[PDB]
Design a protein around this nucleic acid. Structure first.
Ligand SMILES: [Mg+2]
Ligand SMILES: [Mg+2]
Ligand SMILES: [Mg+2]
Ligand SMILES: [Mg+2]
Ligand SMILES: [Mg+2]
Ligand SMILES: [Mg+2]
Ligand SMILES: [Mg+2]
Length: 152
RNA sequence: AAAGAGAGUUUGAUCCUGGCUCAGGACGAACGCUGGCGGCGUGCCUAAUACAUGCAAGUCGAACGAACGG
């Protein structure tokens, strides 16, 4: 069905009259290997509770990934916020080369061979969001009709 | 056909800009602890500072003027 890949655990704090209070936040990316992937985010007082909340949150925001010939159809770069990820196709059997969160999302999507690079900041949530944006900017060869056959 | 990996550190916690440090490759290398063999290579980067000593450029009698042999 769906797997789970925990990307980050952070101990976050807020200060009140009686000192300060801490609570953990989790970023979790889930998906199946057939081409559906999505990320979530939780915030709870104990780590497993945050993991469960993030898992339940991610299973509402999925997206399809076009994977001609088990790789990305073309090159495209995502620019959400302070994040910057570009994705390029790769030769067969080359594996996945990416940072932490980018690797997580690209493998959980099921894409086998792809090479990327992070050209902006290194905030994990912004890296995930930029990768998802870059994925959304993709387009397949067959669905581009625009009154045309293949002629490619 | 070829095609790019990041991480730690400013804050009570954030997101940005920003430097510093680490993870790879290579030596005509040197130092430290160890050290079996074979093949193929390499070895004064500094004082173009000073040289003890051996060798590193000679050869033609079929171009021409002496002695040993007889
Ligand atoms: Mg930095
Ligand atoms: Mg400051
Ligand atoms: Mg080095
Ligand atoms: Mg020995
Ligand atoms: Mg010995
Ligand atoms: Mg010299
Ligand atoms: Mg003669």
């Amino acid at each position: 069905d769906l797997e789970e890949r925990v990307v980050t655990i952070n101990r976050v704090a807020k200060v009140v009259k009686g000192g300060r209070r801490f609570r953990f936040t989790a970023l979790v990316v889930v998906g199946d290997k057939n081409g559906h992937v999505g990320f979530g985010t939780g915030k709870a007082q104990e780590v497993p509770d945050a993991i469960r909340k993030a898992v339940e949150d991610a299973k509402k925001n999925m997206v399809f990934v076009p994977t001609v010939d088990t790789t990305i159809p073309h090159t495209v770069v995502g620019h959400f916020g302070g994040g910057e990820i570009l994705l390029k196709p790769a030769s067969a059997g080359s594996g996945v080369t990416a940072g932490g969160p980018v690797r997580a999302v690209l493998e959980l999507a099921g894409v086998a061979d792809v090479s990327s690079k992070s050209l902006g900041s290194n905030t994990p949530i912004n890296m995930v969001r930029a990768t998802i944006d870059g994925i959304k900017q993709l387009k397949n060869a067959e669905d581009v009709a625009k009154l045309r056959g293949k002629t490619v």
